[PDB]
From a paper:
Versatile peroxidase (VP, EC 1.11.1.16) constitutes the third family of ligninolytic peroxidases, which was described 20-years ago. VP combines catalytic properties of the above two families due to the presence of both a Mn-oxidation site and a catalytic tryptophan in its molecular structure. In the present work, VP (isoenzyme VPL2) from Pleurotus eryngii has been subjected to protein engineering using a rational design strategy.
A high number of basic residues with their side chains exposed to the solvent, most of them with no movement restrictions by interactions with surrounding amino acids, were identified in MnP4 (31 of a total of 34 present in the protein, including 20 lysines and 11 arginines). Seven of these exposed residues (4 lysines and 3 arginines) were introduced into VPi, and the VPi-br variant containing the 8 mutations present in VPi plus mutations T2K/A131K/Q219K/L288R/A308R/A309R/A314R was obtained. The analysis of the VPi-br crystal structure also revealed that the seven solvent-exposed basic residues introduced in this variant present a configuration similar to that observed for the homologous residues in MnP4. Their side-chains appear interacting with water molecules through hydrogen bonds or do not present any interaction, and no contacts are observed with surrounding residues. VPi-br and VPi-ss crystal structures exhibited minor differences compared with VPi regarding the interactions involving the mutated residues in region A (VPi-br also regarding the interactions of residues in region C), and no significant changes were identified in the other regions described. VPi-br harboring seven additional basic residues exposed to the solvent, and VPi-ss containing two cysteines added to form an additional extra disulfide bond, further improved the stability of VPi at acidic pH (respectively). Both variants retained 86% and 85% of the initial activity at pH 3.5 after 24 h of incubation compared to the 61% retained by VPi and far from the 1% of the native VP. In our case, the increased stability of VPi-br at acidic pH compared with VPi could be explained by a general stabilizing effect of the extra basic residues participating in charge-charge interactions with other charged amino acids of the protein surface (although these interactions were not observed in the VPi-br crystal structure) and by interacting with the solvent improving the solubility of the protein. It should be also noted that the polar surface of the VPi-br variant is significantly increased with respect to VPi by replacing five hydrophobic residues (four alanines and leucine) with polar charged amino acids (four arginines and one lysine). Unlike what observed at low pH, VPi-ss only exhibited a slight increased stability after 1 h incubation at pH 7 compared with VPi. Both VPi-br and VPi-ss not only did not show an additional improvement at longer times at neutral pH but, on the contrary, VPi-br significantly reversed the improvement attained in VPi.
Residue numbers in the entry: 1 to 315
The structure:
Amino acid sequence: AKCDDGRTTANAACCILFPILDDIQENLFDGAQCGEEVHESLRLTFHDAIGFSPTLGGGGADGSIIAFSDIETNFPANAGIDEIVEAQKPFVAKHNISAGDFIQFAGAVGVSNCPGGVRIPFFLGRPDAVKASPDHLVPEPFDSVTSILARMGDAGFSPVEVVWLLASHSIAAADKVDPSIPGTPFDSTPGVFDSQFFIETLLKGRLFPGTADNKGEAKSPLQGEIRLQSDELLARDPRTACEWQSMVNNQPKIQNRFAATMSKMALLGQDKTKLIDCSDVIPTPPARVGAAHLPAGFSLKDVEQACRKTPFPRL
Ligand code: HEM
Ligand SMILES: [Ca+2]
Ligand SMILES: [Ca+2]
């Protein structure tokens, strides 16, 4: 199909997305930055989608977190999500697009702003949400690996897919884990979609960036970085450690697996064959990304060698 843009897109329905793209790049993502709103919008994709269980219910990637915001944003596991929910509502209202579609579109567009980022497939056509998600479907940072793998598994994800999806924490920060230091990132490069998150979570902890004893928080290797207990544990657990290590310095794998698994996540509760492929609207991300490295001052002795099959690579 040809849009009024002049642009050719695979399916005519997708032409509606171009005005949406322009508006959100300016007015949601603050001049097309890989900044706070991108990070928040990416988190929203997960908090919407993961509300899906074959037995426990939930409609998955259905916009429920927006449509039923008073219910869902008050779930303890959704702490801090209301800000982005309320920021997205005026865009949904004016752009003739379901909340579920908008959440996934915004997430994909936002990731595309990040150097090193990847294009996530995007499908148009999710109906309006039917029902609120049940509570207790969103993993929390104080949950055990067993719990997280069971919940993610219930939703449809294998342990390696959980690791792949956590590449998201390469462009991510926390506001509520330690409320004394809002905006503290999970890696040294929160504006770059890269492997630093996988490296830095394997360093041996030295300090807390704010206060000690916050629920769900682990010791960090670096001032200005916060570490989740869940990420600390996933990096080290026999079920996930070797996959975690396999990401370090494998940018192409991080990109490829994140895109594929995000697409799967974006389609929970949905049927791709009933939706319209509009992937070609998502921009190409900036390609420049540097080599993976240990932070300044650190050496191999500072790396926890959790994977037993393979040593941590020379960077
Ligand atoms: C697997 C279990 C996971 C746990 C326990 C977890 C936990 C967390 C926590 C505690 C925060 C900080 C919230 C705050 O205090 O402000 C966070 C942020 C974030 N999460 Fe995860 N997460 C998980 C998986 C995911 C997945 C699968 C995605 C994929 C989209 C994701 C994307 C993000 C992003 C992008 C942020 C940063 C938000 C921002 O900076 O505004 N998370 N996550
Ligand atoms: Ca949902
Ligand atoms: Ca990063």
